[PDB]
């Protein structure tokens, strides 16, 4: 899954 | 409230020592109690806000994927029957994870973004906004399925023209919006293309204003522009 | 009870589910269900109730250490007194993990333990009893202290009396139960040199029985073995 | 903390 914040 | 007697500084303090204790489901009960308390919330405390509930909702999301994939597994050719408890499961699981995003964006809608004028705090809760709609969008399949991923849309995009107008580009904010916004794209809209052209402009005009920051600033918005890079990567 | 509409089969499906993914809350809430439906477990029903209740407790205990250790360097000298609120969340966490080992030792009061004839499940039981007096007994500090660490010492005693009759010395159950029982005289009786002994004596014995096992029970009493050799290792 | 199962 790609990188959130 | 079951937080309606504590006060506001002890909910806050409290916060701070479930975070210790990776406790985040208390996390997020405190720190709901401190938003109905009324006030604005400061930066510190809009960010206890914002790692309670990711780190709630992220358990969550983990799970329901999990869930979803046997569920995905048991409806294949050759699969054996084995009734409704694996269907029932992930929708208790998906059910729990609606009613926490409701709850944040209940917070937000009342009365979090309407009191928030400064960029920092706007552009953040409208971040977040962007981000419990999107959640909801990740595990929608009925009639409003489009109106909620158009209600993240437009969270996101409100986020990210106060942004672009009110914050430079290296400003971690803008970057976390931006990552998000670009995932959302990749993720939820079927616009990868969208998404790579976002992550990529992104991180070339926060590279630009790097030159500007003190050492700590620089570290802060290089984080978040690694992020951007390892998103690219794993696009193309 | 909120599980009573649900089938027994159906409760142990899900709390496979919830295990699958890491969601341990449900599990134990699944596995206290297909408990009160009356019915002895199997084996493998039996280690599903055991891993829910031992992934929920052992986050709270987690919990509960960093808070008390917080608590304590609060009382130390020079420190700033900060108010009610570290004694209180302390107090919330361990009011909870009592709340569960309650909930777990009255399970096997009413009625696992009473209807468990074969020395597996009679033992295994026996070893949960002790087990959950002894997280009871590392919160403990009233007038009920010493006959919670001799509730949790007779269970662990009895179990142990049973183990040496009717299992071999490699027998998975019997090995647990010794290495537990040897954590609750080095940690909770004060005991340091019972601890010590009981450890090696039961790994010792063990490494004689080894002889007589297939591959594969012999990977499982060779593991818990190691940990055996492990806490020896760290005391002495 | 000592091994327990
Ligand atoms: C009040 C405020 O200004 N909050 C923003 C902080 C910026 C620094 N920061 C981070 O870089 C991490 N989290 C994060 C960044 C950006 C947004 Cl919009 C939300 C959260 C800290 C954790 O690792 C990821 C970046 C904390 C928040
Ligand atoms: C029904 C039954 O016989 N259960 C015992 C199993 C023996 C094998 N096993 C383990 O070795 C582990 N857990 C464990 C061992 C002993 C006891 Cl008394 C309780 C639990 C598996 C996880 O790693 C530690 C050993 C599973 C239970
Ligand atoms: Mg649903
Ligand atoms: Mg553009
Ligand atoms: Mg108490
Ligand atoms: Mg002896």
Redesign the interface.
Known sequence: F???? | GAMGSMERASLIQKAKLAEQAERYEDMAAFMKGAVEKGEELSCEERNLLSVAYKNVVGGQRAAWRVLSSIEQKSNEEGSEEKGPEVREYREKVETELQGVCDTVLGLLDSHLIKEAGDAESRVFYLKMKG?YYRYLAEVATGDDKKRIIDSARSAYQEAMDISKKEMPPTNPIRL?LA??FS?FH??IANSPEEAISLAKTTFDEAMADLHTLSEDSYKDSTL?MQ?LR??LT??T
């Open positions: 790609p990188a959130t914040v | 981000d976390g990552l998000n995932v990749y993720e978040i992020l390892d998103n794993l696009w």
